[model samples]
Target chain A: QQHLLQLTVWGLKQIQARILAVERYLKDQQL
Target chain B: QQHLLQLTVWGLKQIQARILAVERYLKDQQL
Candidate 1:
């Protein structure tokens, strides 16, 4: 029971988390 | 058995591709 999406999903999460971090940083800095 | 992984993985891949495109666009503009 293996899926190709398993790895792709995790990869997506990493990108989302990174984007979220950048967004929060900018908001905090008022930039 | 239901695997939430299906939706989770698809959601992830979609977002991942989108960000990469934005990244390239930013580089192109040099802004």
Candidate 2:
């Protein structure tokens, strides 16, 4: 159970990173 | 109180979905 929860959190962080990547790219395009 | 929490969840999931979309696009573009 603990391992699964850890995996879930890791997945969430990965998503956050990806979203931030897109945001940075968009911002760069604007500037 | 409850409504705000629900909105936060929905918002996170939408961001998650959008991240998945970009991941898929990147994967397809690679091949």
Candidate 3:
């Protein structure tokens, strides 16, 4: 049976990925 | 059965707790 926690982790990972992408965009603007 | 994901979630919660504390301190300073 699949664990329910995996879905929560996936959401956290997606949020982190978006944050990283935003950081890259900000860094580019600063350069 | 106990899953390994609980440990990761606990760590995440601890980190978030610290972050919230820091945010509160910063806000106090800003006031």
Candidate 4:
């Protein structure tokens, strides 16, 4: 069996960037 | 199917507390 959209370096980086952005937003709101 | 699903008010509270803790950790790490 095969799944669509295999993970790649770019995908990983995008996800990491999104998480960092959310974390930054939350911190800014808290302060 | 069997899955471990832990759901309790206490668990939720603990998770919320941990998120705040992570936010603090990141902030301190940033400065």
Candidate 5:
């Protein structure tokens, strides 16, 4: 169970990074 | 533990949808 939680945390962090990338791309387009 | 897993699944799905949205936006920009 702890292992599963760890995997979830890692996955969430990766997705969060992707979200930041998307935001940056959008911002660049706006500028 | 089951509840935590469920929440993780939901979060993953939400992120997946957001990723798809980002891809669509990028495609639109390309076009």
Candidate 6:
């Protein structure tokens, strides 16, 4: 249980950025 | 090798639908 992938702040930020990018793309498609 | 593969499509759909509902609820709550 102790062994798991520990995401760093930078890594999490990268993922959040990607999510925002996808969200923007979806919004653009809707528009 | 035999294992129990136990999951109904309705059950999965329910959980996924619940998640979407919660997200929508949270967005409305934010607004």
Which candidate achieves the best DockQ against the true structure? Answer: 5
Best model number under lDDT: 5
- Candidate 6 Cα misplacement greater than 4 A, ranges: A1-7, B1-31
TM-score of chain A as modeled in candidate 1: 0.78
Accuracy of chain B in candidate 4 (TM-score): 0.62
* CA error at residue A1 for candidate 4, angstroms: 21
Residue-by-residue lDDT tens digits, candidate 1, B1-31? 7776777776776777787776676557653
RMSD after CA superposition, every candidate: 4.5, 6.1, 5.4, 9.9, 2.7, 12.1
Q: lDDT of each model, Cα atoms only?
A: 0.69, 0.69, 0.63, 0.55, 0.80, 0.49
Docking class of 4: incorrect
Residues B1-31 of candidate 6: C-alpha lDDT, one tens digit per residue = 4221232334445555655654675586573
lDDT string, candidate 4, B1-31, tens digits? 4221332334445556656776787778784
Q: Which residue ranges in model 4 land beyond 4 Å of their true spot?
A: A1-7, B1-31
Tens-digit lDDT track for model 4 on A1-31? 4532333334544655665676687678774
TM-score between predicted and true chain B, model 5: 0.81
DockQ of each candidate relative to the true complex: 0.33, 0.26, 0.16, 0.05, 0.55, 0.04
Give per-residue lDDT, candidate 3, residue B15. Answer: 54
Where model 1 places Cα greater than 4 Å from the true spot, the runs are A1-13, A20-31, B1-3
Least accurate stretch of 10 residues (summed lDDT) in model 5 chain A?
A1-10
Per-residue lDDT tens digits for candidate 6, residues A1-31, read 5422233334444655665565576557653
Candidate 2 has a DockQ of 0.26
- Model 2, position A22, has a per-residue lDDT of 74
User: Which 10 consecutive residues of model 4 chain A have the lowest summed lDDT?
Assistant: A3-12
**Global CA lDDT computed for model 2:** 0.69
Give residue A27's error in model 6 in angstroms.
Answer: 0.2
Best by the TM-score measure: 5
Name the regions of candidate 2 deviating beyond 4 angstroms. Answer: B1-17, B22-31
